[PDB]
Design a protein around this ligand. Sequence first.
Ligand code: CU
Ligand code: CU
Ligand code: ZN
Ligand code: ZN
Lengths: 156, 156
Amino acid sequence: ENTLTVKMNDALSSGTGENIGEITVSETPYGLLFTPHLNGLTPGIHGFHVHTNPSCMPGMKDGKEVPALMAGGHLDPEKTGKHLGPYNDKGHLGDLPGLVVNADGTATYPLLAPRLKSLSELKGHSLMIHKGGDNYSDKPAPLGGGGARFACGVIE
Amino acid sequence: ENTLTVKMNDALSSGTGENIGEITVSETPYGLLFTPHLNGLTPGIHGFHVHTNPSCMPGMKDGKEVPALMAGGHLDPEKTGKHLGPYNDKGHLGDLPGLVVNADGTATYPLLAPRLKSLSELKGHSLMIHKGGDNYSDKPAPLGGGGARFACGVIE
Ligand SMILES: [Cu+2]
Ligand SMILES: [Cu+2]
Ligand SMILES: [Zn+2]
Ligand SMILES: [Zn+2]
């Protein structure tokens, strides 16, 4: 098989919340395929990124608890400093296609990330689902408009 | 840049229906990107494929009208006879990822077809949106379970 299974949990101010399912990651000739099996999300498109650190723990920023802050920022080993989505090599390597949530709150639609080649590249990082969407740009809102971190899972 | 814009219209038993927008196809290093700007669709995931003929004309089969019958079958230059989706090269080259329709009936989520490399592979063909979904296989239903043709656009 050669797959990874990532358990995803809601992210709260105090710590980890409810489990919402798993994402199965597989290798294809065209890149990594993220097949979700999730529930408990708001219907629509959600920002979906690999973050640098292997943690989903909440942390303090400017005096306020921030869910899943300890995952750090979007995975960016090339130091692009730019959020440009899964089809643009000028931005964060961790930028994945938006996560598609169905009307019934489940996520099932598989997502191809063609800039990622090997499951090894995900180990030691985290997967993040944001409250908002992802227009694959830093404008008009930074980081695609994803906003707050809703659910997260550590890879390894 | 090198783009194609495909106007899409509803396909009725009696012919061409209302315009529902356009799909813009761009070339990327990862394959052709299909960026919809559509309205008027049922929320959910819709079968989305390139069909062989540059026609959206209707026809009759077994005494029942078939919207956009004259588009023919899925684009299949290798004569696979197999519907296996956008990530499997043993199948119809015309097999694209499912088209994602938002709760408000619009389609905006970009769709990457990594098996297609050049817009020239599309010239002289048609784009089709089905009523049903697409499980990227011929089981339990042929052609992914997309069923009837809901909307159609000719490429050249
Ligand atoms: Cu993120
Ligand atoms: Cu079709
Ligand atoms: Zn990013
Ligand atoms: Zn097909």
